[PDB]
Amino acid sequence: MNTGHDGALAYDEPIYLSDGNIINIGEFVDKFFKKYKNSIKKEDNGFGWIDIGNENIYIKSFNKLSLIIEDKRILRVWRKKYSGKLIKITTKNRREITLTHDHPVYISKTGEVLEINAEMVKVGDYIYIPKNNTINLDEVIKVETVDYNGHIYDLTVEDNHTYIAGKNEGFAVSASSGTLHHHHHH
């Protein structure tokens, strides 16, 4: 069990459906929490998740296995409350996102995809981003934060452990389920 890890996104990060709905992650989740009120499970750690694999809805995902853009369907979602400073890593293409400092994201190591914390991804690291069908690099330019005090939200995209989320068109980053890739089923 690490100190860092275990992320989430701000309420007003887009999530880019396979249909392009450009909806707030927090509204997306909360719709389910407001219909499936009965289905609001809490964790022992007092979190709050719901399965939405029953909506079957498709998100624009990507597959790490070839850095390809495909669909998937989400299986569960999460919500927590947060107040603090979130990292606002911009890139030249006016991308940006609103996430934790210990948030797993990807960078170039000179041609290799490597996996690090967002707080290390400054104006001297190349933060991996999606393109059309493909993956590209863009330069981190502006390095600052926001103050945020609302709620935060996360997923269960267990399927390839990768999703799109963020602002503009978004970032191809890690997804998970329980913890640093455990999967305890059968």
PDB file of C-alpha atoms in Angstrom:
ATOM      1  CA  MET A   1       0.000   0.000   0.000  1.00  0.00           C
ATOM      2  CA  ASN A   2       1.711   3.210  -1.176  1.00  0.00           C
ATOM      3  CA  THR A   3       1.657   6.744   0.293  1.00  0.00           C
ATOM      4  CA  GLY A   4       0.795   8.436  -3.031  1.00  0.00           C
ATOM      5  CA  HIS A   5      -1.128   6.810  -5.895  1.00  0.00           C
ATOM      6  CA  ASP A   6      -5.008   6.639  -5.781  1.00  0.00           C
ATOM      7  CA  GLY A   7      -6.023   9.633  -7.960  1.00  0.00           C
ATOM      8  CA  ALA A   8      -9.224  11.316  -9.201  1.00  0.00           C
ATOM      9  CA  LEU A   9     -10.277  14.197 -11.548  1.00  0.00           C
ATOM     10  CA  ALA A  10     -11.990  17.555 -10.855  1.00  0.00           C
ATOM     11  CA  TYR A  11     -15.764  17.857 -11.269  1.00  0.00           C
ATOM     12  CA  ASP A  12     -15.508  19.861 -14.576  1.00  0.00           C
ATOM     13  CA  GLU A  13     -13.024  17.659 -16.475  1.00  0.00           C
ATOM     14  CA  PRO A  14     -14.593  16.349 -19.736  1.00  0.00           C
ATOM     15  CA  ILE A  15     -14.532  12.535 -20.290  1.00  0.00           C
ATOM     16  CA  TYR A  16     -15.065  12.281 -24.110  1.00  0.00           C
ATOM     17  CA  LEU A  17     -17.660   9.591 -24.766  1.00  0.00           C
ATOM     18  CA  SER A  18     -17.323   7.502 -27.956  1.00  0.00           C
ATOM     19  CA  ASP A  19     -20.099   9.960 -29.075  1.00  0.00           C
ATOM     20  CA  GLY A  20     -18.340  13.152 -27.889  1.00  0.00           C
ATOM     21  CA  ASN A  21     -20.897  14.382 -25.338  1.00  0.00           C
ATOM     22  CA  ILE A  22     -18.411  16.872 -23.667  1.00  0.00           C
ATOM     23  CA  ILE A  23     -20.038  16.461 -20.263  1.00  0.00           C
ATOM     24  CA  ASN A  24     -18.633  17.147 -16.767  1.00  0.00           C
ATOM     25  CA  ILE A  25     -17.274  13.972 -15.129  1.00  0.00           C
ATOM     26  CA  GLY A  26     -19.020  15.014 -11.907  1.00  0.00           C
ATOM     27  CA  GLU A  27     -22.443  15.445 -13.582  1.00  0.00           C
ATOM     28  CA  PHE A  28     -21.943  12.151 -15.471  1.00  0.00           C
ATOM     29  CA  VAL A  29     -21.256  10.270 -12.243  1.00  0.00           C
ATOM     30  CA  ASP A  30     -23.903  12.146 -10.242  1.00  0.00           C
ATOM     31  CA  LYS A  31     -26.724  11.310 -12.704  1.00  0.00           C
ATOM     32  CA  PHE A  32     -26.091   7.667 -11.747  1.00  0.00           C
ATOM     33  CA  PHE A  33     -25.812   8.557  -8.020  1.00  0.00           C
ATOM     34  CA  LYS A  34     -29.219  10.376  -8.363  1.00  0.00           C
ATOM     35  CA  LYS A  35     -31.023   7.518 -10.190  1.00  0.00           C
ATOM     36  CA  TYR A  36     -29.178   4.595  -8.630  1.00  0.00           C
ATOM     37  CA  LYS A  37     -29.402   6.207  -5.148  1.00  0.00           C
ATOM     38  CA  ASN A  38     -30.184   2.717  -3.845  1.00  0.00           C
ATOM     39  CA  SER A  39     -27.085   1.442  -5.686  1.00  0.00           C
ATOM     40  CA  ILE A  40     -24.647   3.942  -3.939  1.00  0.00           C
ATOM     41  CA  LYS A  41     -22.192   1.479  -2.326  1.00  0.00           C
ATOM     42  CA  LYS A  42     -19.736   2.961   0.131  1.00  0.00           C
ATOM     43  CA  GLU A  43     -16.362   1.385   0.808  1.00  0.00           C
ATOM     44  CA  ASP A  44     -15.038   0.588   4.290  1.00  0.00           C
ATOM     45  CA  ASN A  45     -12.731   3.586   3.696  1.00  0.00           C
ATOM     46  CA  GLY A  46     -16.042   5.518   3.223  1.00  0.00           C
ATOM     47  CA  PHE A  47     -15.602   6.303  -0.473  1.00  0.00           C
ATOM     48  CA  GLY A  48     -18.687   5.827  -2.720  1.00  0.00           C
ATOM     49  CA  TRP A  49     -18.890   3.864  -6.027  1.00  0.00           C
ATOM     50  CA  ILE A  50     -21.669   2.548  -8.351  1.00  0.00           C
ATOM     51  CA  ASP A  51     -21.547  -0.019 -11.195  1.00  0.00           C
ATOM     52  CA  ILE A  52     -22.679   1.493 -14.477  1.00  0.00           C
ATOM     53  CA  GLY A  53     -21.619  -1.411 -16.782  1.00  0.00           C
ATOM     54  CA  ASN A  54     -25.429  -1.863 -17.039  1.00  0.00           C
ATOM     55  CA  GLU A  55     -25.691   1.470 -18.937  1.00  0.00           C
ATOM     56  CA  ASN A  56     -23.242  -0.219 -21.408  1.00  0.00           C
ATOM     57  CA  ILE A  57     -22.285   3.402 -22.535  1.00  0.00           C
ATOM     58  CA  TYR A  58     -19.029   3.765 -24.560  1.00  0.00           C
ATOM     59  CA  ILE A  59     -16.118   6.067 -23.698  1.00  0.00           C
ATOM     60  CA  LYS A  60     -13.276   6.906 -26.079  1.00  0.00           C
ATOM     61  CA  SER A  61     -10.521   4.829 -24.512  1.00  0.00           C
ATOM     62  CA  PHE A  62      -7.117   3.792 -25.822  1.00  0.00           C
ATOM     63  CA  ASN A  63      -5.107   0.523 -25.631  1.00  0.00           C
ATOM     64  CA  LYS A  64      -1.533   0.692 -24.242  1.00  0.00           C
ATOM     65  CA  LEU A  65      -0.700  -2.535 -26.125  1.00  0.00           C
ATOM     66  CA  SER A  66      -0.136  -0.486 -29.337  1.00  0.00           C
ATOM     67  CA  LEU A  67      -1.043   3.114 -28.271  1.00  0.00           C
ATOM     68  CA  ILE A  68      -4.225   2.819 -30.386  1.00  0.00           C
ATOM     69  CA  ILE A  69      -7.535   4.639 -29.954  1.00  0.00           C
ATOM     70  CA  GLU A  70     -10.579   2.345 -29.592  1.00  0.00           C
ATOM     71  CA  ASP A  71     -13.804   2.272 -27.504  1.00  0.00           C
ATOM     72  CA  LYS A  72     -14.557   0.607 -24.230  1.00  0.00           C
ATOM     73  CA  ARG A  73     -17.449   0.700 -21.700  1.00  0.00           C
ATOM     74  CA  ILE A  74     -16.767   1.788 -18.053  1.00  0.00           C
ATOM     75  CA  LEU A  75     -17.753  -0.779 -15.398  1.00  0.00           C
ATOM     76  CA  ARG A  76     -17.840   1.260 -12.097  1.00  0.00           C
ATOM     77  CA  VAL A  77     -17.267   4.895 -11.078  1.00  0.00           C
ATOM     78  CA  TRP A  78     -16.112   6.580  -7.850  1.00  0.00           C
ATOM     79  CA  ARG A  79     -16.669   9.917  -6.057  1.00  0.00           C
ATOM     80  CA  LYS A  80     -14.813  11.458  -3.095  1.00  0.00           C
ATOM     81  CA  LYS A  81     -14.638  14.955  -1.586  1.00  0.00           C
ATOM     82  CA  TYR A  82     -11.444  16.971  -1.853  1.00  0.00           C
ATOM     83  CA  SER A  83     -10.159  20.428  -1.093  1.00  0.00           C
ATOM     84  CA  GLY A  84      -6.574  21.379  -2.120  1.00  0.00           C
ATOM     85  CA  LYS A  85      -4.395  22.545  -5.030  1.00  0.00           C
ATOM     86  CA  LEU A  86      -4.756  20.513  -8.267  1.00  0.00           C
ATOM     87  CA  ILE A  87      -2.072  20.488 -11.002  1.00  0.00           C
ATOM     88  CA  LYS A  88      -3.037  22.245 -14.294  1.00  0.00           C
ATOM     89  CA  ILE A  89      -0.280  20.967 -16.709  1.00  0.00           C
ATOM     90  CA  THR A  90      -0.893  22.828 -19.945  1.00  0.00           C
ATOM     91  CA  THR A  91       0.618  21.922 -23.317  1.00  0.00           C
ATOM     92  CA  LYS A  92       1.250  24.094 -26.430  1.00  0.00           C
ATOM     93  CA  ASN A  93      -2.022  22.785 -28.043  1.00  0.00           C
ATOM     94  CA  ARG A  94      -3.822  24.467 -25.064  1.00  0.00           C
ATOM     95  CA  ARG A  95      -4.545  21.106 -23.472  1.00  0.00           C
ATOM     96  CA  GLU A  96      -4.773  21.030 -19.706  1.00  0.00           C
ATOM     97  CA  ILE A  97      -6.254  18.802 -16.933  1.00  0.00           C
ATOM     98  CA  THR A  98      -7.180  19.180 -13.231  1.00  0.00           C
ATOM     99  CA  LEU A  99      -5.673  16.354 -11.109  1.00  0.00           C
ATOM    100  CA  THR A 100      -3.539  15.358  -8.093  1.00  0.00           C
ATOM    101  CA  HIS A 101       0.241  15.737  -7.786  1.00  0.00           C
ATOM    102  CA  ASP A 102       0.742  11.952  -7.288  1.00  0.00           C
ATOM    103  CA  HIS A 103      -1.354  11.223 -10.418  1.00  0.00           C
ATOM    104  CA  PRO A 104       0.053   8.483 -12.775  1.00  0.00           C
ATOM    105  CA  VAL A 105       0.600   9.849 -16.293  1.00  0.00           C
ATOM    106  CA  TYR A 106       2.967   8.988 -19.180  1.00  0.00           C
ATOM    107  CA  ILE A 107       6.027  10.771 -20.572  1.00  0.00           C
ATOM    108  CA  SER A 108       8.660  10.286 -23.242  1.00  0.00           C
ATOM    109  CA  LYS A 109      11.937   8.710 -22.280  1.00  0.00           C
ATOM    110  CA  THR A 110      13.588   9.592 -25.582  1.00  0.00           C
ATOM    111  CA  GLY A 111      11.316   7.196 -27.541  1.00  0.00           C
ATOM    112  CA  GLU A 112      10.165   4.862 -24.718  1.00  0.00           C
ATOM    113  CA  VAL A 113       6.797   5.376 -22.963  1.00  0.00           C
ATOM    114  CA  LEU A 114       7.529   5.760 -19.231  1.00  0.00           C
ATOM    115  CA  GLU A 115       5.116   6.149 -16.292  1.00  0.00           C
ATOM    116  CA  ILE A 116       5.609   8.896 -13.627  1.00  0.00           C
ATOM    117  CA  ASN A 117       3.763  11.323 -11.253  1.00  0.00           C
ATOM    118  CA  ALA A 118       2.132  14.496 -12.698  1.00  0.00           C
ATOM    119  CA  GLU A 119       4.170  16.731 -10.317  1.00  0.00           C
ATOM    120  CA  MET A 120       7.393  15.506 -12.045  1.00  0.00           C
ATOM    121  CA  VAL A 121       5.896  16.318 -15.528  1.00  0.00           C
ATOM    122  CA  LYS A 122       7.142  19.952 -15.685  1.00  0.00           C
ATOM    123  CA  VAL A 123       8.240  22.248 -18.583  1.00  0.00           C
ATOM    124  CA  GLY A 124      11.204  19.850 -19.161  1.00  0.00           C
ATOM    125  CA  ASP A 125       9.146  16.633 -19.629  1.00  0.00           C
ATOM    126  CA  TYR A 126       7.177  15.576 -22.712  1.00  0.00           C
ATOM    127  CA  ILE A 127       3.711  14.503 -21.466  1.00  0.00           C
ATOM    128  CA  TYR A 128       2.288  11.850 -23.818  1.00  0.00           C
ATOM    129  CA  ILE A 129      -1.032  12.901 -25.467  1.00  0.00           C
ATOM    130  CA  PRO A 130      -3.517  11.270 -27.936  1.00  0.00           C
ATOM    131  CA  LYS A 131      -3.842  12.382 -31.568  1.00  0.00           C
ATOM    132  CA  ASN A 132      -6.350  11.324 -34.290  1.00  0.00           C
ATOM    133  CA  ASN A 133      -6.053   7.515 -34.361  1.00  0.00           C
ATOM    134  CA  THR A 134      -2.654   7.702 -32.719  1.00  0.00           C
ATOM    135  CA  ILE A 135      -0.432   9.035 -29.890  1.00  0.00           C
ATOM    136  CA  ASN A 136       1.851  12.151 -30.080  1.00  0.00           C
ATOM    137  CA  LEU A 137       4.064  14.340 -27.840  1.00  0.00           C
ATOM    138  CA  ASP A 138       3.387  17.987 -26.894  1.00  0.00           C
ATOM    139  CA  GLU A 139       5.475  20.300 -24.683  1.00  0.00           C
ATOM    140  CA  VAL A 140       4.398  21.138 -21.090  1.00  0.00           C
ATOM    141  CA  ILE A 141       4.898  24.983 -21.414  1.00  0.00           C
ATOM    142  CA  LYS A 142       2.832  26.403 -18.430  1.00  0.00           C
ATOM    143  CA  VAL A 143       3.331  24.755 -15.005  1.00  0.00           C
ATOM    144  CA  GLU A 144       0.896  25.931 -12.277  1.00  0.00           C
ATOM    145  CA  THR A 145      -2.169  24.778 -10.262  1.00  0.00           C
ATOM    146  CA  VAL A 146      -5.769  25.647  -9.332  1.00  0.00           C
ATOM    147  CA  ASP A 147      -7.328  25.706  -5.863  1.00  0.00           C
ATOM    148  CA  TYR A 148     -10.347  23.329  -5.821  1.00  0.00           C
ATOM    149  CA  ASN A 149     -12.816  22.532  -3.024  1.00  0.00           C
ATOM    150  CA  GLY A 150     -15.680  20.550  -4.504  1.00  0.00           C
ATOM    151  CA  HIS A 151     -15.836  16.822  -5.118  1.00  0.00           C
ATOM    152  CA  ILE A 152     -13.542  14.616  -7.283  1.00  0.00           C
ATOM    153  CA  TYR A 153     -14.387  11.482  -9.333  1.00  0.00           C
ATOM    154  CA  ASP A 154     -12.586   8.390 -10.774  1.00  0.00           C
ATOM    155  CA  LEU A 155     -13.385   5.202 -12.744  1.00  0.00           C
ATOM    156  CA  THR A 156     -13.076   1.493 -13.091  1.00  0.00           C
ATOM    157  CA  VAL A 157     -11.783   1.038 -16.621  1.00  0.00           C
ATOM    158  CA  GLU A 158     -10.254  -2.310 -15.721  1.00  0.00           C
ATOM    159  CA  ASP A 159     -10.431  -3.457 -19.322  1.00  0.00           C
ATOM    160  CA  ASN A 160      -7.145  -2.034 -20.581  1.00  0.00           C
ATOM    161  CA  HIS A 161      -6.317   0.039 -17.430  1.00  0.00           C
ATOM    162  CA  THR A 162      -6.213   3.153 -19.720  1.00  0.00           C
ATOM    163  CA  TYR A 163      -8.799   5.933 -20.442  1.00  0.00           C
ATOM    164  CA  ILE A 164      -9.196   9.380 -21.989  1.00  0.00           C
ATOM    165  CA  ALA A 165     -10.045  12.259 -19.646  1.00  0.00           C
ATOM    166  CA  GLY A 166      -9.068  15.961 -19.341  1.00  0.00           C
ATOM    167  CA  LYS A 167      -9.795  19.318 -21.058  1.00  0.00           C
ATOM    168  CA  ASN A 168      -9.712  20.297 -24.770  1.00  0.00           C
ATOM    169  CA  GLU A 169      -9.590  16.753 -26.225  1.00  0.00           C
ATOM    170  CA  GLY A 170      -8.022  15.104 -23.153  1.00  0.00           C
ATOM    171  CA  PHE A 171      -5.124  12.879 -22.113  1.00  0.00           C
ATOM    172  CA  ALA A 172      -4.619   9.124 -22.492  1.00  0.00           C
ATOM    173  CA  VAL A 173      -3.623   8.192 -18.893  1.00  0.00           C
ATOM    174  CA  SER A 174      -3.691   5.169 -16.570  1.00  0.00           C
ATOM    175  CA  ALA A 175      -6.974   3.738 -15.371  1.00  0.00           C
ATOM    176  CA  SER A 176      -7.343   1.091 -12.722  1.00  0.00           C
ATOM    177  CA  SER A 177      -9.798  -0.694 -10.411  1.00  0.00           C
ATOM    178  CA  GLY A 178      -8.592  -1.848  -6.995  1.00  0.00           C
ATOM    179  CA  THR A 179      -5.100  -0.533  -6.322  1.00  0.00           C
ATOM    180  CA  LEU A 180      -1.883  -0.830  -8.410  1.00  0.00           C
ATOM    181  CA  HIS A 181      -3.238  -3.584 -10.743  1.00  0.00           C
ATOM    182  CA  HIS A 182      -4.348  -6.340  -8.275  1.00  0.00           C
ATOM    183  CA  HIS A 183      -7.538  -7.852  -9.895  1.00  0.00           C
ATOM    184  CA  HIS A 184      -8.778 -10.348  -7.282  1.00  0.00           C
ATOM    185  CA  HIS A 185     -11.636 -12.367  -8.902  1.00  0.00           C
ATOM    186  CA  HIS A 186     -11.672 -15.932 -10.355  1.00  0.00           C
TER     187      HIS A 186
END
